[PDB]
DNA sequence: GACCTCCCT
DNA sequence: AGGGAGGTC
């Protein structure tokens, strides 16, 4: 395997700063904000270079052409390189074209995660894969200079290569302009996002740690007292003893490993034994303290009271964003006690405010306007609560007629019917039977005989063409849809009808993110985005904007798209995350 | 290092 | 329907 030739640079020239490049700007520790660059690639028309990064970053004529957005330069997952420059006060512009997100769309399903992942999307195998030049888990390291280098500039002219042929099939793809004016501009959004970071209130969540510290150790106490015993309580094996053979516990559901302890099963056998209750208890608490006190401490940086997330843009099957590091999707909001973890998340300046907006049922006010059912379009021209008109439309009665618990059953089918679900999933969801499931799901697609009609016209679409798309042209493969075996086929068939729902909803929230920051930008407003949790935006921003933020925020979500039903967005703001309701 | 419950939309 | 994050072996 020889070499491929390049220059290993001990100095900027100025070849090296074409109007067209491919460019590497290498940061090899996964979590990358405040992190070492390890070295830096490009690739034009010139040549091919390898530049040390104590050298081109010192250089001013090379962070000139850096932030330049003349020169353009095509880079596999920019927003990495993006935000590693700005911890070093450098300004990324100009970037083209992103190998990372053009895969994705292309293919989520290959979860492409590195170069050599995409290049083999077009029979190009002349670069390693990352893992094998970084290796994995405690052997991962940077390699000797000869190797990172020629590596890195492997990438690069992979770069360079792999460009015409990606944007030419996602041209055919139609889904040209869903990476130039969509992926890539929201790429550069999450970057300032990612940096700016949320501010945390260290001091509430320490004390909140406290205290539940106490009550963890007093339900600990009850649980070992109503046991007669001690023992790990976090141990599958030695809780599923505790209940199932020492107290004798009936068992309702067996896991393959062994008992199940999950909370729906622990909510039926609390009649039976006072410890149950306690367990749960513990384990909402335990939840809690392990992951939204511990998890969150561990993770804010301390110099700026700080949690600075990454979100992955190029990885969920639907087009939706993911976050880690720490997930800001999934802080506790159902349970009050839970929620209160919000309340340490503060405006990262004094007088300034949490602004939180959300789209209301998103999901299915899309599925309104794809399946151009008529009963459902009116219910949202009107602006009923749908859960309650859909408890009307299912059991034939009047508004007055609706009980909470028909309400909360007609609530499970609509979620049930955005995720394509069927008889069997709505049963074990509505703890009832698969008959009667079935007849619920008969009674929706009654009223709604346009739901019905696309869930169908979905499924053969996905047969016919191998994929569905959304709104916005994003695409999903769905090779399973003519498996012969039963459960394979029919999680496929779900997906068929979920995808192009949850997808167009992620593709209309990117487009709002894009359109709010050009207009915050136009209007001199110094309110800033700092999350975005699928179907609502948070920005923090002075007490002062807020009223127009009150306007000018919901006003962008809603015209982000023009679907055949108004799309609606509630707001709040307050001193805290939690206090923004 | 791999494999196997509960938080969010 | 999509996701992210301690015990056992
Ligand atoms: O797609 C964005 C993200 O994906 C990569 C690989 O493409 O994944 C690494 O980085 C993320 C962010 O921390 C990690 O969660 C993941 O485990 C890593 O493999 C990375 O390049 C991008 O930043
Ligand atoms: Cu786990």
Same mark, same amino acid.
């Given at each position: 395997a020889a070499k491929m030739a390049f220059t290993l640079a001990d100095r900027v020239t100025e070849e090296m700063l074409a109007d067209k490049a491919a460019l590497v700007v290498?940061?090899?520790?996964?979590?990358?904000?405040?992190?070492?660059?390890?070295?830096?690639?490009?690739?034009?028309?010139?040549?091919?270079?390898?530049?040390?990064?104590?050298?081109?970053?010192?250089?001013?004529?090379?962070?000139?052409?850096?932030?330049?957005?003349?020169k353009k330069k095509?880079?596999?997952?920019?927003?990495?390189?993006? #935000? =590693?420059?700005?911890? %070093?006060?450098?300004?990324?512009?100009? /970037?083209?074209? $992103?190998?990372?997100?053009?895969?994705?769309?292309?293919?989520?399903?290959?979860?492409?995660?590195? #170069? =050599?992942?995409?290049? %083999?999307?077009?029979?190009?195998?002349? /670069?390693?894969? $990352?893992?094998?030049?970084?290796?994995?888990?405690?052997?991962?390291?940077?390699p000797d200079e000869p190797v990172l280098a020629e590596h890195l500039v492997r990438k690069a002219a992979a770069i360079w290569a792999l460009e015409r042929p990606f944007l030419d099939e996602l041209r055919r793809n139609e889904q040209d302009r869903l990476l130039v004016e969509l992926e890539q501009p929201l790429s550069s959004i999450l970057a300032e996002m990612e940096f700016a970071g949320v501010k945390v209130d260290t001091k509430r969540l320490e004390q909140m740690g406290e205290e539940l510290a106490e009550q963890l150790r007093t339900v600990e106490q009850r649980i070992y007292e109503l046991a007669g015993q001690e023992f790990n309580i976090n141990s599958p094996k030695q809780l599923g003893v505790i209940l199932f053979e020492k107290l004798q516990l009936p068992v309702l559901k067996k896991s393959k490993t062994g008992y199940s302890t999950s909370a729906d099963v622990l909510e039926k056998l609390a009649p039976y034994h006072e410890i149950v209750e306690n367990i749960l208890h513990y384990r909402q608490l335990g939840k809690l303290q392990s992951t939204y006190i511990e998890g969150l401490?561990?993770?804010?940086?301390?110099?700026?009271?700080?949690?600075?997330?990454?979100?992955?843009?190029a990885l969920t099957q639907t087009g939706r964003l993911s976050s880690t590091e720490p997930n800001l999707q999934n802080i506790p909001i159902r349970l009050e006690e839970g929620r209160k973890i919000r309340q340490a998340f503060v405006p990262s300046e004094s007088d300034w405010l949490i602004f939180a907006a959300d789209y209301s049922q998103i999901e299915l006010r899309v599925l309104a306007h794809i399946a151009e059912d008529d009963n459902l379009m009116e219910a949202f021209r009107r602006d009923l609560d749908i859960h309650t008109k859909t408890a009307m439309d299912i059991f034939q009665v009047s508004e007055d007629e609706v009980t909470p618990n028909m309400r909360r059953q007609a609530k499970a089918v609509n979620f049930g019917i955005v995720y394509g679900i069927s008889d069997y999933g709505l049963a074990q969801n509505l703890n009832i039977s698969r008959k009667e499931a079935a007849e619920?799901?008969?009674?929706?697609?009654?009223?709604?005989?346009?739901?019905?009609?696309?869930?169908?016209?979905?499924?053969?679409?996905?047969?016919?063409k191998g994929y569905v798309t959304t709104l916005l042209h994003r695409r999903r493969y769905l090779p399973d849809i003519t498996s012969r075996n039963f459960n394979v086929r029919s999680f496929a068939e779900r997906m068929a009808m979920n995808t192009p729902i949850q997808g167009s909803a992620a593709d209309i929230i990117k487009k709002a993110m894009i359109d709010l920051n050009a207009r915050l930008k136009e209007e001199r407003l110094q309110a800033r985005l700092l999350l975005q949790v699928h179907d609502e935006l948070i920005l923090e921003a002075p007490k002062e904007e807020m009223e127009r933020l009150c306007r000018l925020v919901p006003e962008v979500m809603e015209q982000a798209v023009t679907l055949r039903v108004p799309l609606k967005v509630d707001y709040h703001y307050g001193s805290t995350w939690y206090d923004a309701k």
């Open positions: 290498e940061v090899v520790e996964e979590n990358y904000h405040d992190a070492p660059i390890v070295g830096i690639a490009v690739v034009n028309e010139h040549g091919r270079f390898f530049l040390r990064p104590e050298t081109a970053l010192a250089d001013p004529q090379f962070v000139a052409w850096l932030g330049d957005e003349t095509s880079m596999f997952d920019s927003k990495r390189a993006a #935000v =590693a420059l700005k911890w %070093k006060g450098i300004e990324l512009c100009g /970037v083209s074209f $992103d190998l990372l997100l053009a895969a994705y769309l292309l293919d989520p399903a290959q979860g492409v995660d590195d #170069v =050599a992942a995409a290049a %083999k999307m077009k029979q190009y195998e002349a /670069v390693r894969p $990352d893992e094998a030049v970084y290796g994995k888990g405690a052997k991962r390291a940077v401490l561990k993770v804010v940086r301390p110099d700026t009271k700080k949690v600075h997330t990454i979100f992955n843009q619920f799901i008969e009674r929706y697609f009654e009223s709604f005989p346009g739901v019905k009609r696309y869930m169908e016209n979905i499924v053969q679409e996905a047969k016919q």
